[PDB]
């Protein structure tokens, strides 16, 4: 993540699925963790969804998220939107 360093990402070709984030993490752009003017919903590779792990918050990787994560307009222009599958594999 932008702040916590040891957090590792996925970075695969995103699928059709949309990543979920919990109400606790709601509002953060999964890359920069910004609250401003979100744009496009996150898309994750199928390898990050499958079973129960699909329900996890793509940000904090623990809680079960209801909400969809959106990229901000700064990351959508920086292109990090399309970089790959954001997810946090290690808890940190």
């Amino acid at each position: 993540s932008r702040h916590q360093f040891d957090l590792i990402m996925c970075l695969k070709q995103p699928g059709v699925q949309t990543g979920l984030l919990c109400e606790k993490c709601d509002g953060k752009c999964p890359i920069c963790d910004s609250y401003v003017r979100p744009k496009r919903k996150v898309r994750v590779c199928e390898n990050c969804s499958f079973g129960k792990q699909a329900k996890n918050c793509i940000i904090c990787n623990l809680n079960v998220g209801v909400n969809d994560a959106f990229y901000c307009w700064e990351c959508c222009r920086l292109g990090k939107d399309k970089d790959g599958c954001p997810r946090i594999l290690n808890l940190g």
Partner: protein
């Protein structure tokens, strides 16, 4: 830890986007990336492809496109030499 992550992201970005100069990169390795991307865009835009077709004067345009594709590999020079 942080730099150590930058190493892994160096491996991933290098894998996806092919040539990315890390620290020490030979001029042969890097110039090859230059040639590959320049040709890539010359053939990639139908615009510049149409342009090189006429300025070169080839009989067909796909000759220029597949020419650039072939020109991406180094051995294509010797290949032309053997014609």
């Amino acid at each position: 830890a942080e730099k150590q992550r930058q190493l892994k992201l160096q491996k991933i970005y290098k894998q996806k986007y092919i040539g990315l100069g890390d620290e020490s990169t030979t001029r042969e390795q890097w110039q090859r990336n230059v040639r590959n991307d320049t040709l890539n865009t010359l053939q990639g835009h139908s615009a510049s492809l149409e342009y090189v077709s006429l300025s070169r004067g080839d009989l067909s345009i796909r000759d220029t496109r597949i020419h650039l594709l072939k020109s991406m590999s180094p051995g294509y020079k010797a290949y032309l030499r053997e014609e």
